[PDB]
């Protein structure tokens with residue numbers, strides 16, 4: 004029993020983190036095979052990054068894997084990520100893929116400083132394409148990932164903090180999540196919305212763990228609920244979301260539209276001094292799979 | 304900016320998790336140098352578990368009865384000993400991935416990271432606190448016995464918890480790595496219950512300081528309090544007493560923020576009296592007590 008915000012074991016990624024220093028800036032890079040990936044804004048000196056990089060020589064890039072130093076033998080740019088070719092293939096390179104995640108999906112973040120891992124936590128790609136992480140100066144290049152079996156799927160590289168304190172980054176191919184640029188300009192997180200399918204998944208997690216007070220005899224329609232959803236700044240619930248929740252509906256005897264009626268009442272009446280899984284708010288950073296994985300016991 | 308329940312990177316502990324099998328029972332062990340540590344109830348049957356005589360049970364075991372598996376490598380047991388409620392299996396191979404480590408017994412309110420493990424394979428990592436009633440609020444399923452809790456300040460792993468069982472209220476109990484249970488619990492199936500829990504006052508105060516550091520001041524007030532008047536109010540909300548040690552420990556965060564410790568206590572008093580009025584603090588609608596003062600400085604400063 005118990006339900007907790009749980010990150011993937013980070014060992015396979017710790018062995019890939021390195022420190023990258025160009026000019027005055029130091030941040031983190033990801034060492035896979037014979038390439039180090041890091042944010043292109045490490046580029047020394049409204050920037051024209053292709054033009055700034057030609058001035059740079061391989062030996063301007065200091066790369067350290069612990070005490071050991073890696074020799075840069077080439078450099079290239081892919082969107083907002085810089086790729087440093089090094090002389091040595093990382094002997095601890097895991098089986099891995101680069102993937103791009105969708106809003107509402109979760110991943111583990113390995114927060115790093117000076118190439119040394121310092122913490123791991125779970126976070127969701129918000130509908131406004133930010134994440135609510137915990138990053139200080141020097142965390143740029145920290146990465147986000149999921150693990151399926153022995154395969155690490157890298158999905159996020161951290162680039163910047165926005166004025167509201169939330170965070171923005173790219174996939175490992177250098178494409179930003181959301182309408183952001185890697186520049187000193189005026190940028191702001193858009194208005195956010197609540198990830199409806201994830202709230203429902205969390206209510207099923209609560210039921211599985213004995214928290215049942217919010218259940219009621221009623222059910223609703225997808226059309227009726229989604230009108231309540233938009234009213235409360237909740238993402239629309241689609242039939243595909245209903246399908247994904249199928250497993251949990253079968254396991255608990257609570258149909259999704261049966262649970263939507265519960266969520267409707269919670270949105271309209273509050274929780275009246277009660278809590279669900281130790282929270283006084285509705286939590287939307289657990290996916291249906293996160294709830295199945297943790298209420299069943301998958302391992303890596 | 305931001306403030307999150309942050310676990311330590313788990314790789315140094317992942318390299319130590321093994322599977323231990325006795326009879327029909329399989330659980331997790333911790334492999335450091337040439338020793339595998341696991342809960343001694345791995346030698347029990349469910350019948351034994353009402354009033355097991357562990358000394359009598361262990362003397363009947365042969366080394367080859369213990370099947371220890373590290374990945375796809377079967378380790379061979381060459382001896383065994385029992386220390387309180389932990390079984391120490393001597394193996395013929397030292398773990399080449401053994402980190403710098405220590406065993407530490409922690410006090411209520413301390414936090415640590417838990418590496419949930421099944422059949423010797425890590426599943427996930429999350430942050431826990433030792434509650435005042437010597438339980439933890441974890442996420443543990445059947446087969447999680449032997450999972451460990453740890454901290455990694457500098458590059459040394461301090462092991463502080465090994466998971467043994469789940470109590471009737473859904474909370475969890477275990478030992479330190481010397482085999483001594485936290486709290487009054489025993490590794491028997493006899494009736495046992497967690498005591499009434501209380502809120503870890505010093506940690507709430509640390510978290511409120513974290514909130515100020517992150518730029519939130521809505522809960523401050525113009526009042527102060529004596530330490531004794533604070534504790535008279537706090538105990539009425541089932542909060543732990545705040546000691547002069549707790550006040551000393553908060554000195555650094557007080558200095559950084561410019562808010563005296565007893566002024567922050569006055570703010571907490573008001574929050575307990577009023578609630579949040581539909582507001583949040585660091586994204587929570589409740590007062591969070593599983594961040595220590597040391598945690599706050601670690602995450603908000605370095």
Ligand SMILES: Cc1cncc(C(=O)N2C[C@H]3CC[C@@H](C2)N3[C@@H](c2cccc(F)c2)c2cn(CCc3ccsc3)nn2)c1
Nearest residue numbers: 004328347348349352443444445446447468469490491492
């Ligand atoms: C939800 C959960 C959370 N954390 C840990 C668990 C989890 O796996 N066990 C913990 C619990 C509950 C089941 C079992 C193992 N118990 C063992 C137990 C019971 C009472 C006190 C105690 F100190 C330990 C236990 C071990 N044996 C021997 C025969 C046997 C072996 C495997 S099943 C039966 N008999 N009882 C479960």
Ligand SMILES: [Cl-]
Nearest residue numbers: 408409410413
């Ligand atoms: Cl302690």
Ligand SMILES: [Mg+2]
Nearest residue numbers: 219221261264
């Ligand atoms: Mg209903």
